[PDB]
Design a protein around this ligand. Structure first.
Ligand code: HEM
Ligand SMILES: *[C@@H]1O[C@H](CO)[C@@H](O[C@@H]2O[C@H](CO)[C@@H](O)[C@H](O)[C@H]2NC(C)=O)[C@H](O)[C@H]1NC(C)=O
Ligand SMILES: *[C@H]1O[C@H](CO)[C@@H](O)[C@H](O)[C@@H]1O
Ligand SMILES: [Ca+2]
Ligand SMILES: [Ca+2]
Ligand SMILES: [Ca+2]
Ligand code: NA
Length: 357
């Protein structure tokens, strides 16, 4: 079909997603893999994973827009602390782009956001999820203090995910920061390149922790290998769950397998997201609108590298059967600050709408 703007696409039903992408980019992302992009990507996961095979449909409808349609319920669960900002940012689009379901909006926005992160895959995007659902129940969202057994169980119960798929999905922590885990600091990044969809998170979680970016006593957090911060350039934070996954026998080799393997990581993330984005639905009942997902920013193609102040002697390895790759180290004796802003600065306040969540 040919859309009003003259864009030729796969199906007429995909046309409305074009101005929605444009509005999202102009209004909240500005084509950056920044704060607002990060929060929406997190929302795609919190929306989708709230489903349970064993509990039945009454527990939650998966990728169903429930966070937007019931903004006062799930966003106030403690495991959803901080999700309100992303919900409040997407609700005005739901009201404006009113031929697109809340559920479709959430998944598509996540694909758009990810496209701004150099190295990310161009996600599959199927459309047609209904605009009516129920509020999910509490306890369906994995938490950083959770054990690996509990985490893997939750993912298997939600949609049959394998441990490979689970770790694949955690490539999103390559473009992720923490605002709620520590009450004193904000935007503590999970890797030294939170604006780049690279494999640094996999490497950096395997280094010996040497301090904390904030307090040493936060639930769900463990020591960080790069805790130095200054001004708004908060130090790296390490989640207990990421650390646990990197060292548990079930997932240690998969974790290490993404180190310095960009295309493998990206391809695996795309495959897992294909499954996550249609939880609560039969994919044979959704139309393919992948062609209206923006083309992602390409990676530079550079190998993963040890950040300054770290090196191979700092590795805590847990995969007996696979050789840890030979990597270079960025020159310098002391840790480099991790920039708060995509353009290297420390001042870049994102657009935030007030709302019901
Ligand atoms: C065992 C699984 C996981 C756990 C326990 C976990 C936990 C967390 C935690 C605690 C935060 C910090 C939130 C804050 O305090 O502001 C976070 C942020 C993030 N998560 Fe995860 N997560 C998991 C899986 C996922 C998955 C599967 C994705 C998406 C595909 C996702 C994407 C992100 C993003 C993008 C952020 C950054 C948000 C921002 O910087 O504003 N996470 N995660
Ligand atoms: C999906 O449901 C939401 C919530 O009922 C709808 O949102 C309303 O949209 C209209 C414009 O169409 C606004 O005037 C209302 O303020 C919105 N309500 C709320 C609670 O925000 C939305 O229109 C529906 N979308 C589709 C595709 O049917
Ligand atoms: C980042 O900054 C550190 C100093 O904090 C250097 O050691 C490194 O080489 C890079 O310039
Ligand atoms: Ca949901
Ligand atoms: Ca990164
Ligand atoms: Ca955030
Ligand atoms: Na709130």
């Amino acid at each position: 079909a040919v859309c009003p703007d003259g864009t030729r696409v796969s199906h007429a039903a995909c046309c409305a997603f074009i101005p929605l992408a444009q509005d999202l980019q102009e209004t909240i992302f500005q084509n950056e893999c920044g704060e607002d992009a990060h929060e929406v990507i997190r929302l795609t996961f919190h929306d989708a994973i709230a489903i349970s095979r064993s509990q039945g449909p009454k527990a939650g409808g998966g990728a169903d827009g429930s966070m937007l349609l019931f903004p006062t319920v799930e966003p106030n669960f403690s495991a959803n602390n901080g999700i309100d900002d992303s919900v409040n940012n997407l609700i005005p689009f739901m009201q404006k782009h009113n031929t697109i379901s809340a559920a479709d909006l959430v998944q598509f926005a996540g694909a758009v956001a990810l496209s701004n992160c150099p190295g990310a895959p161009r996600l599959e995007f199927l459309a047609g999820r209904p605009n009516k659902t129920i509020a999910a129940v509490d306890g369906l969202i994995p938490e950083p203090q959770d054990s690996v057994t509990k985490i893997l169980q939750r993912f298997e119960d939600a949609g049959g995910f394998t441990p490979f798929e689970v770790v694949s999905l955690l490539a999103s922590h390559s473009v992720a920061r923490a605002d709620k885990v520590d009450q004193t600091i904000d935007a503590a990044p999970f890797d030294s390149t939170p604006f780049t969809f690279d494999t640094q998170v996999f490497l950096e979680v395997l280094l010996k922790g040497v301090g904390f970016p904030g307090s040493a006593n936060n639930t769900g957090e463990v020591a960080s290998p790069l805790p130095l911060g200054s001004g708004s350039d908060t130090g790296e934070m390490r989640l207990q769950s990421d650390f646990a996954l990197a060292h548990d026998p079930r997932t240690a080799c998969i974790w290490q397998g993404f180190v310095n393997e960009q295309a493998f990581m990206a391809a695996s993330f795309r495959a897992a997201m294909s499954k996550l984005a249609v939880l609560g639905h039969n994919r044979n009942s959704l139309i393919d609108c992948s062609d209206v997902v923006p083309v992602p920013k390409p990676a530079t193609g550079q190998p993963a590298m040890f950040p300054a102040s770290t090196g191979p002697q700092d590795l805590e390895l847990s995969c007996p059967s696979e050789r840890f790759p030979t990597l270079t180290t960025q020159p310098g004796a002391s840790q480099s600050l991790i920039a708060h802003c995509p353009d290297g600065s420390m001042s870049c306040p994102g657009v935030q709408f007030n709302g019901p969540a």
